[PDB]
Design an enzyme around this catalytic site. Structure first.
Site, mmCIF file in Angstrom:
data_model
loop_
_atom_site.group_PDB
_atom_site.id
_atom_site.type_symbol
_atom_site.label_atom_id
_atom_site.label_comp_id
_atom_site.label_asym_id
_atom_site.label_seq_id
_atom_site.Cartn_x
_atom_site.Cartn_y
_atom_site.Cartn_z
ATOM 1 N N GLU A 1 -3.538 0.664 -8.646
ATOM 2 C CA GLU A 1 -4.355 -0.138 -7.743
ATOM 3 C C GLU A 1 -5.320 -0.951 -8.599
ATOM 4 O O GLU A 1 -6.086 -0.401 -9.391
ATOM 5 C CB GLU A 1 -5.095 0.774 -6.759
ATOM 6 C CG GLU A 1 -4.134 1.582 -5.887
ATOM 7 C CD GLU A 1 -4.815 2.681 -5.086
ATOM 8 O OE1 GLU A 1 -5.917 3.114 -5.461
ATOM 9 O OE2 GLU A 1 -4.227 3.129 -4.087
ATOM 10 N N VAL B 1 -5.950 0.733 0.099
ATOM 11 C CA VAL B 1 -6.296 -0.031 -1.101
ATOM 12 C C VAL B 1 -4.989 -0.616 -1.634
ATOM 13 O O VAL B 1 -4.163 0.100 -2.152
ATOM 14 C CB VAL B 1 -6.922 0.897 -2.167
ATOM 15 C CG1 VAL B 1 -7.412 0.088 -3.353
ATOM 16 C CG2 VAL B 1 -8.064 1.701 -1.539
ATOM 17 N N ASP C 1 0.868 -1.177 0.000
ATOM 18 C CA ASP C 1 0.000 0.000 0.000
ATOM 19 C C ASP C 1 0.908 1.230 0.000
ATOM 20 O O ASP C 1 1.027 1.941 1.000
ATOM 21 C CB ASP C 1 -0.910 -0.011 1.234
ATOM 22 C CG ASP C 1 -1.909 1.130 1.233
ATOM 23 O OD1 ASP C 1 -2.097 1.742 0.171
ATOM 24 O OD2 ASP C 1 -2.515 1.416 2.282
ATOM 25 N N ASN D 1 0.820 4.333 -1.219
ATOM 26 C CA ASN D 1 0.325 5.656 -0.838
ATOM 27 C C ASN D 1 -0.522 5.637 0.438
ATOM 28 O O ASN D 1 -1.167 6.629 0.783
ATOM 29 C CB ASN D 1 -0.465 6.271 -2.003
ATOM 30 C CG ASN D 1 -1.607 5.395 -2.447
ATOM 31 O OD1 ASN D 1 -1.648 4.221 -2.107
ATOM 32 N ND2 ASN D 1 -2.536 5.952 -3.219
ATOM 33 N N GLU E 1 -1.918 -2.731 -3.794
ATOM 34 C CA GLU E 1 -1.404 -2.786 -5.165
ATOM 35 C C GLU E 1 -0.661 -4.108 -5.266
ATOM 36 O O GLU E 1 -0.234 -4.658 -4.253
ATOM 37 C CB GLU E 1 -0.351 -1.707 -5.459
ATOM 38 C CG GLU E 1 -0.736 -0.277 -5.217
ATOM 39 C CD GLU E 1 -0.325 0.204 -3.847
ATOM 40 O OE1 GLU E 1 0.792 -0.104 -3.382
ATOM 41 O OE2 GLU E 1 -1.119 0.918 -3.233
ATOM 42 N N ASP F 1 0.370 -12.509 -15.611
ATOM 43 C CA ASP F 1 1.588 -11.850 -16.074
ATOM 44 C C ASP F 1 1.655 -11.326 -17.505
ATOM 45 O O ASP F 1 2.708 -10.845 -17.930
ATOM 46 C CB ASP F 1 2.792 -12.763 -15.831
ATOM 47 C CG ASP F 1 2.653 -14.108 -16.511
ATOM 48 O OD1 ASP F 1 2.278 -14.138 -17.702
ATOM 49 O OD2 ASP F 1 2.928 -15.134 -15.855
ATOM 50 N N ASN G 1 -3.475 4.404 1.405
ATOM 51 C CA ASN G 1 -4.891 4.764 1.399
ATOM 52 C C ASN G 1 -5.785 3.565 1.717
ATOM 53 O O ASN G 1 -7.013 3.644 1.597
ATOM 54 C CB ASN G 1 -5.279 5.364 0.043
ATOM 55 C CG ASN G 1 -5.169 4.364 -1.078
ATOM 56 O OD1 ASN G 1 -4.725 3.244 -0.860
ATOM 57 N ND2 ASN G 1 -5.569 4.760 -2.282
ATOM 58 N N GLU H 1 -5.621 -25.712 -19.341
ATOM 59 C CA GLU H 1 -5.723 -24.386 -18.739
ATOM 60 C C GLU H 1 -6.702 -23.360 -19.297
ATOM 61 O O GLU H 1 -7.393 -22.683 -18.531
ATOM 62 C CB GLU H 1 -4.330 -23.747 -18.694
ATOM 63 C CG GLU H 1 -3.307 -24.531 -17.882
ATOM 64 C CD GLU H 1 -1.948 -23.852 -17.852
ATOM 65 O OE1 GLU H 1 -1.882 -22.674 -17.446
ATOM 66 O OE2 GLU H 1 -0.946 -24.494 -18.231
HETATM 67 CA CA CA Z 1 -2.907 2.091 -2.202
#
Ligand code: CA
Ligand code: CA
EC number: 3.2.1.-
Lengths: 758, 758
Positions: free
Chosen positions: A548, A436, A430, A432, A438, A500, A434, A726
């Site tokens: 995010e 939420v 996280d 930043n 990443e 990926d 906030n 797959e």
């Molecule tokens: Ca964040």
């Protein structure tokens, strides 16, 4: 079980240790059970009739064939060989072959008895005495692709220390193996053995890598033989008493296996509306998942389930978090004991305070654990990976086991582990702050220098320059004077996302990118910036994409939702309220920040230099096109009804996701779309099922049922006897991927129970 | 100079900034002189007639075209354009074109006036008044390969900060350039300019990237124009007074250039027995070397000579030691001032005690120096390289300058620098300390970690694994369970040898290797082990191949031999005795250890785990085949007469080295031979000449003369007007390599002087 014969083609006569298909996976589908470390195939004709060929050895982290014919029976009367006709088939939990001749008949049944031993019952019917002969031969050739040799290399020539040898014993014979530490091909302790024990006295003649055993019987009789692949000296010692037990009371072991499988089917086949064909798919899924289950081995002290026992890089007991969540969710419904174990296996190596390698990652769950620890932890394993983790549906998975068992002690056991993992995301993923998360990567030897400087290589033409330092990286990205930029940490972040090659993470080929720019876009729109995460004291905690993800945020919503329920179950009301509050905050962020009112869909958002007036880190990345992450808020239940209604319309649009095989990994309209691209077009069963469940959650079950029907009628090979793979081409339905793939099996089973019907 | 028109085809109308040939070198041959940083081409026809097209700018380290037509003259009378017929040619030191019409003729002569300015004389003869018009336009397209664009990219699109701008001035016009730091393509300071100054007033109109200048004359008149490429603000200021002086005495500058070139020719063409064709080759060599001469620029404070002004990676003022030794040896015979400067440039950056980057490398001479210093030394240059040096023929080169000038002050100047380099080899390139150096590499960010652990990558299939540590390296090599091993330091060692793909250094392709093993050889025979060199106190000094090269030993013999000669010249008898002793010991080692009687040839020797009984580090590596290093002992004078006689027989054998174009980089019998492989078959002029000189030194001048004649008659394009390249196919004589290649020119000149005859 007899109602499901040959659900998967398990016939084959391997002639190479590595008898691979086009993608380097073993091209045959051996039968494994009870978490054992060796498997067997069915005879495919007169040349293998009398035995179960293709002994497959799981050498710690890989699957390697040991022999084609091995302990193949031939019967003789008055010095002449009896001429049999063959009938061979598999059933859930066993391999069977019946040999028929005029005066002699043989019925062989092979089942597993322990996590290291299989049991063969050889039922012989004869009105007169007979002479029995068993023969076997170790493979010599090393590698082949689709039946064609890749080279003339031999097993012994490639691995001089393997030094395979066959030795006679007091009740059979054994094959011994020398120590081979071929990191990416063959791993042995130097004490592993393959043992054959029999219930009657036999005469054995060994000729190098082949053998012939003889025995004389007076008439109809049933003999018993055990086959054991033991990986360490300790395992060899411990198994002897088990083998003695098996030979003393074989009926008990055959019965135990039979009943265990009757139970898997009874508990798993819970959809009365399913057609026989749809039910057969469910059975294939059950056989696949159980075959990929491995008992404890090496550094993994718990039973686990890998992506594929026949896969080039998914064998042995290699385990991933992402796969485990879906595997356990499905297995909770038919093999709950192993579902629980699989979850335990992954969390057993969760980082603890004061960890010797990464004390800054408390709560972190490794991307890959296996028999051998990495050199950083004292082993010589090359697969063990801690450069990243995977998307977390851990709570979701743990809760499903509870839904089935209603076992509160299970919740009590896992709760603290889930909380620690939950907290790790908030501290190390996280950037930043906030709330939420990443996707990102950890501090690692492959990601940075000794002093903690982030490594990266700039590529321009044929020039490759490696540099380090976040500052230098910033300068390079600014100028953009390069063909490509390779950052090990960012590569690991793509692995952490579970996709990926997805368009949302900046992946697009030259051809597609040129067209994009030609339509008015800028190539910079596809540049995903990267950042480092440091604690208030300057300690490097890891890395984060300056973006995010909406699926990631939705999984976090799910995590809080389930943790709240568990807290309530455990009588922790204040903790429950906290998680409920965390969930609401994430739902609001997802709906306000990631939903684009114009295109009526959800997208990732960039972590821009400055947040927006509404508090969002950045605007939704609509320019990179729509993907399955778009319905993640629906599957996880974070979406408002209005936003869900909007997304469903896009999903059902034939110009977007409603294709031949619906709900692919990229909308037809995505600028980086490719019908054959794994994460930019191909349909995966997990994202497909997430889509249908999201649809159903918001009142669109009828439409979900329709898409499921389309899937059943168009997904290639679904009703055939091939192994589960797959993904699928969304336009043609053609399959691709490793055979006997666990998570596809898991979601196919879910589809059988939730959406398939007559 | 008038006796040598169009020795090299200098015509062309570039249409791309990067108008490359198949190997990425500029496909035209602009005229450069006086060490200037811009060049000109001759008009190819009616489309460019009236001007010298293809302004070539040397942007610090690369050659980039600025425009096709620029300042092209057209003549008008009564609104009608005068129709001219064209005549254009180059001569050593100048470009000339004549425009002919009935009542109007124009004669233009272009020569260089200063290290930053060229001078154009425009003589117009007319019986009536005329209206003159000059036009020009900057290039727009970015890149092409032999006429076919590599993309639709534009210069401005690729380099947004280049912002080329044409502005009118009171006496002409100028083009300014923004700051571009494209490490591998274009380097500008943000203050560079291309200025046009004229002796007559003209009104210039600018329209985007094109311009039109007009002037009216009352009759016959002669004007002068200067063209200047100035790379810095300081250069721009300083050149103004020069331009003024040039325009005040134009005829004096033209005469000075003419005289300077007459002197180059008088001093250089001294072989009275050469045919006109052979003399022309010598002139081409002179034109080539003088064109590759650059005045001081950036970090290089001396005039220097690069491998090729038109090369993809050899332009700007990039200088290497190996090339410099041969360049200066040749130039001593016609442009000694620059030969001395070229040598001074290389040594100007020789490591001094207390160096801020590699204090452990005192005496070391960098592999590559250029305008921009490496980031390690405060610059942003990506070419500057100190990962290795090059084979040493420094003393040999310095001596040739003395042999010509007889200037003892020159020897006094260089002696200490040569001594320092000599001592460096013994400290940092002698792993087993026996006084016989090896090729190796330095301690560098690209070779080791911060703690000094050697970096290396192990490749197996599609799996790559970067590790560090000599101990880990040793293990990996012992198991041999890999397809390839990438070691940055060992790669640098191949560069230090000067033959990065030579068979003797372990370079052989799969096909050739499989064949070698199939013939009874061991694959490990081609594995060149590597080692680190540490001082008494444990300090890492660098690395060495665990192999002593016979050419390396022969060059060290040369170094000691020439240092002894210099000591004597400088009146240092005791120092002379010491160097003579060192030379003697090296010769004894070469003859005793590296000569193989059985095959009558010399070879490198491995530094085996233990020395041989006679003290030799190892047995000659006869199994890797014969190469040019085999006659290095002859060229350098270390061989005994008997061993020389043996080697010459092999050299003259048509089944070994006496091919269509004789003396290639690998004998026809070499197991890794390839007629088109740069260092495993192709013939280079330096190794060829080394062979002839070695032959002659030991009594075979007659045979050397014969080979020289064979070379003259068989080397493709020798008597044509194409630029000089790098090498030849030994079987066909076909050419390959960068055009306008300095060291080929250097040795072609040497051949003219020593062996080419009528
Ligand atoms: Ca964040
Ligand atoms: Ca040595």
């Amino acid at each position: 079980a007899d109602n499901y014969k040959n659900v998967i083609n398990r016939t084959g006569a391997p002639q190479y240790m590595k008898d691979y298909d086009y993608d380097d996976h073993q091209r045959f589908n051996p039968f494994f059970d009870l978490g054992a470390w060796h498997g067997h195939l069915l005879p495919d004709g007169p040349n293998t009739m009398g035995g179960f060929p293709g002994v497959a050895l799981l050498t710690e982290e890989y699957i390697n064939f040991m022999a084609s014919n091995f302990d193949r029976l031939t019967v003789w009367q008055d010095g002449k060989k009896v001429d049999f006709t063959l009938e061979a088939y598999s059933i859930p939990g066993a391999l069977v072959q019946k040999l028929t001749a005029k005066d002699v008949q043989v019925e062989m049944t092979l089942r597993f008895a322990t996590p290291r031993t299989s049991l063969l019952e050889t039922k012989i019917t004869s009105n007169k005495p007979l002479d029995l002969v068993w023969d076997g031969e170790l493979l010599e050739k090393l590698e082949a692709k689709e039946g064609k040799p890749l080279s003339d290399k031999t097993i012994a020539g490639e691995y001089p220390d393997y030094q395979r040898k066959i030795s006679a014993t007091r009740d059979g014979l054994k094959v011994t193996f020398g120590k081979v530490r071929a990191t990416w091909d063959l791993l042995t302790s130097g004490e592993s053995e393959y043992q054959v024990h029999k219930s009657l006295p036999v005469q054995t003649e060994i000729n190098g890598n082949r053998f012939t055993s003889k025995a004389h019987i007076n008439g109809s009789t049933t003999l018993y033989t055990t086959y054991s692949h033991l990986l360490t000296a300790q395992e060899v010692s411990k198994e002897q008493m088990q083998i003695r037990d098996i030979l003393a009371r074989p009926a008990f072991y055959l019965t135990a296996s039979q009943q265990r499988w009757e139970e898997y089917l009874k508990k798993g086949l819970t959809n009365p509306d399913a057609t026989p064909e749809q039910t057969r798919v469910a059975v294939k899924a059950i056989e696949t998942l159980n075959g990929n289950w491995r008992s404890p081995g090496g550094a993994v002290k718990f039973n686990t389930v890998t992506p594929s026992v026949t896969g080039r890089w998914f064998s042995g007991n290699q385990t991933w978090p992402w796969d485990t969540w879906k595997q356990a969710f499905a297995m909770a419904h038919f093999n709950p004991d192993i579902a629980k174990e699989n979850i335990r296996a992954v969390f057993s190596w969760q980082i603890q305070p004061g960890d010797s390698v990464r004390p800054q990652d408390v709560g972190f769950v490794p991307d890959l654990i296996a028999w051998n620890l990495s050199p950083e932890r004292g082993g010589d394993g090359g697969n063990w990976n801690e450069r990243n983790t995977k998307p977390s549906l851990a709570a979701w998975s743990v809760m499903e086991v509870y839904n089935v068992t209603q076992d509160k002690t299970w919740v009590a056991e896992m709760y603290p582990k889930l909380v620690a993992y939950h907290d790790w995301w908030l501290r190390n993923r996280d950037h930043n702050g906030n709330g939420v998360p990443e996707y990102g990567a950890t501090r690692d030897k492959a990601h940075n220098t000794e002093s903690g400087e982030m490594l990266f290589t700039v590529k321009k033409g044929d020039k490759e320059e490696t540099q380090s330092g976040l500052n230098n990286y910033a300068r390079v990205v600014e100028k953009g004077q390069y063909d490509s930029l390779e950052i090990p940490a960012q590569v690991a972040a793509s692995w952490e996302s579970g996709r990926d090659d997805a368009a949302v993470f900046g992946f697009i080929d030259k051809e597609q990118l040129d067209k994009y720019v030609a339509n008015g876009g800028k190539r910079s729109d596809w540049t995903v910036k990267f950042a480092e995460n440091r604690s208030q004291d300057g300690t490097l905690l890891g890395y984060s994409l300056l973006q995010e993800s909406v699926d990631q945020a939705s999984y976090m919503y799910s995590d809080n939702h389930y943790l709240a329920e568990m807290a309530t179950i455990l009588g922790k009301p204040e903790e429950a309220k906290r998680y409920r509050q965390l969930a609401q905050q994430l739902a609001d962020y997802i709906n306000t920040c990631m939903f684009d009112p114009t295109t009526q869909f959800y997208y990732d958002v960039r972590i821009e230099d400055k947040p927006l007036a509404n508090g969002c880190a950045g605007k939704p990345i609509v320019e990179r096109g729509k993907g399955p992450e778009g319905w993640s808020p629906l599957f996880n239940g974070a979406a408002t009804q209005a936003n869900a209604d909007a997304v469903v319309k896009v999903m059902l649009d034939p110009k977007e996701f409603n294709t031949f095989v619906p709900l692919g990994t990229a909308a037809l309209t995505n600028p980086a779309f490719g019908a054959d691209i794994y994460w930019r077009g191909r349909v995966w069963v997990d994202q497909f099922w997430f889509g249908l469940k999201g649809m159903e959650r918001y009142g669109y079950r009828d439409d979900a049922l329709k898409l499921a029907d389309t899937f059943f009628r168009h997904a290639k090979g679904l009703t055939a006897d091939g192994p589960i793979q797959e993904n699928y081409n969304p336009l043609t339905g053609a399959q691709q991927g490793a055979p006997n793939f666990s998570w596809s099996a898991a979601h196919l089973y879910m589809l059988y129970n939730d959406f398939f019907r007559k």
